[PDB]
Write an enzyme that holds these catalytic residues in place. Sequence first.
Site, short mmCIF file in Angstrom:
data_model
loop_
_atom_site.label_atom_id
_atom_site.label_comp_id
_atom_site.label_asym_id
_atom_site.label_seq_id
_atom_site.Cartn_x
_atom_site.Cartn_y
_atom_site.Cartn_z
CG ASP A 7 3.20 -4.53 -3.80
OD1 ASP A 7 3.80 -3.45 -4.00
OD2 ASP A 7 2.16 -4.62 -3.12
CE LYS A 68 6.62 2.38 -4.71
NZ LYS A 68 5.69 1.20 -4.59
CD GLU A 172 2.56 0.46 -6.58
OE1 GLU A 172 1.73 1.15 -5.94
OE2 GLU A 172 3.82 0.55 -6.44
CG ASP A 196 -3.27 1.08 -3.70
OD1 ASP A 196 -3.05 1.06 -2.46
OD2 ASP A 196 -2.54 0.51 -4.55
N1 LIG Z 1 -6.74 -5.64 8.69
C1 LIG Z 1 -6.27 -4.37 8.57
N2 LIG Z 1 -7.00 -3.31 9.00
C2 LIG Z 1 -6.54 -2.04 8.89
N3 LIG Z 1 -5.34 -1.72 8.36
C3 LIG Z 1 -4.51 -2.70 7.90
C4 LIG Z 1 -4.94 -4.10 7.97
N4 LIG Z 1 -3.94 -4.84 7.45
C5 LIG Z 1 -2.96 -3.99 7.06
N5 LIG Z 1 -3.31 -2.72 7.34
C6 LIG Z 1 -2.52 -1.50 7.08
O1 LIG Z 1 -2.16 -1.44 5.70
C7 LIG Z 1 -0.99 -0.62 5.58
C8 LIG Z 1 -0.03 -1.31 4.62
O2 LIG Z 1 -0.61 -1.35 3.32
P1 LIG Z 1 -0.03 -2.32 2.18
O3 LIG Z 1 -0.91 -2.06 0.99
O4 LIG Z 1 0.15 -3.69 2.77
O5 LIG Z 1 1.46 -1.71 1.90
P2 LIG Z 1 1.94 -0.47 0.98
O6 LIG Z 1 1.05 0.71 1.27
O7 LIG Z 1 3.41 -0.33 1.40
O8 LIG Z 1 1.80 -0.95 -0.43
C9 LIG Z 1 -0.42 -0.47 7.00
O9 LIG Z 1 -0.77 0.81 7.53
C10 LIG Z 1 -1.18 -1.53 7.79
O10 LIG Z 1 -1.26 -1.22 9.19
MG LIG Z 2 0.85 -0.47 -2.24
NA NA Z 3 2.62 -3.51 -0.71
NA NA Z 4 -0.91 3.12 -2.21
#
Ligand SMILES: Nc1ncnc2c1ncn2[C@@H]1O[C@H](COP(=O)(O)OP(=O)(O)O)[C@@H](O)[C@H]1O
Ligand SMILES: [Mg+2]
Ligand code: NA
Ligand code: NA
Lengths: 387, 92
Positions: A7, A68, A172, A196
Amino acid sequence: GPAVGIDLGTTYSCVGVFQHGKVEIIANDQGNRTTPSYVAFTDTERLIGDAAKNQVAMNPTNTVFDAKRLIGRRFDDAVVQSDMKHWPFMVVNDAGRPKVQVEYKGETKSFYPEEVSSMVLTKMKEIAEAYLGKTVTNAVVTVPAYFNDSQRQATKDAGTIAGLNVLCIINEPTAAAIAYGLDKKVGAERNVLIFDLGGGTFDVSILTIEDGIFEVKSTAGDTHLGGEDFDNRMVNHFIAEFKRKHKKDISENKRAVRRLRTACERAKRTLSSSTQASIEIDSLYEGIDFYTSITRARFEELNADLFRGTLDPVEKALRDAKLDKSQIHDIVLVGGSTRIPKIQKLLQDFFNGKELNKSINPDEAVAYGAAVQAAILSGDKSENVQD
Amino acid sequence: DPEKLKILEWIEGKERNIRALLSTMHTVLWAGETKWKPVGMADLVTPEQVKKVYRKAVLVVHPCKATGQPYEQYAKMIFMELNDAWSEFENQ
Ligand SMILES: Nc1ncnc2c1ncn2[C@@H]1O[C@H](COP(=O)(O)OP(=O)(O)O)[C@@H](O)[C@H]1O
Ligand SMILES: [Mg+2]
Ligand code: NA
Ligand code: NA
């Protein structure tokens, strides 16, 4: 040696492998199952992931993220021109193509978006190789459902530059459905909604699945809504608090603001499992230590509008797919931000109490499905059918 | 459906004999498939020949390329049988 699923996320990346009948989401050498999509250039080294994000406050103009958002685009694209205003790093035009420009080892250097993303993919490859004790070449890499051919090809090219053979570029939301084995069901078609909420973007997708064949029926969301925005609401709250306590304004000190934001993101995560969180920063601004507390209640309030607003793209997706909310078979939580209890409550209430699919860590679900798919495409997951 | 039945009967009849499958794969491909040329048993004698032809075949029926196409289901069925036949061949 197995193929891996990656991912390659806007803010974080994640790598899994299907081995010995189970998907392992692979922890990096700092113990994290997700890795920041950050690349830093310094006097002596190139840093990637946790080490890159961790020094952002000290080296903001040579720390690249959000690649990205540039990948597969032209410099003159409206999106690129708009996004450039938010970034502390330089973006320049090379014969119509955007490049990030940085200082590296005392030298001015520029990289194409796919070159920056290759550095993230290289790190994820290395994470998997550490775990497997063997080289990794083959991978499935995921992208947003709304990505076009240019963005898909640029993502593939990033893989090639990272020394990977990309078996397939898949969507995704489709990866997340695969993680839950939703494409293994038979009989009447089923409607699946993917909710998402990540670090930078919010995506709602409605998939129809029949006999393991996917159709993306509608997509909605906001490419500029995510966890970063919730962090920022906390940041402004504590800037006010500091000014009132100390008769000092930290707003224009970029290092102090970034140091505070880091502390806020950590507290936010804590607030998904606890009802309060404490913040401790040594010498935040002009010798002053910053210590404070925040409740889950206060965090939710600070973000009240942004949270309830997530339901509008859900409604929009549903009408574009020409479906009532009572017509959705499975709802899947994806993205780190969907760990927020208030988000989960808002979505479940919308669907009149229906159960949410969240048993797979939502920030890991995309990598999980990619890993399954990579094994299938490699001939390493025979039987059942084809998932 | 008749196309699915055709593939199921092909799979059962060839007994996971990789050469029998490759030498007859032209009979089960969808109408509109134009890349694959029928391969005769003369070009399937040595293990090197079998591997070369197998690799060509999986490219034609690859699920990634097939995604979203009318023949997607059928490509997937052929791909998975070829993989199983190849793994059996390697075990010998
Ligand atoms: N336990 C949690 N509670 C709230 N927010 C979280 C938690 N764990 C991760 N996040 C938030 O999720 C976001 C990242 O999302 P993720 O799906 O891992 O990546 P992306 O959006 O790049 O695909 C960040 O803002 C992070 O702070
Ligand atoms: Mg994502
Ligand atoms: Na991710
Ligand atoms: Na997203």
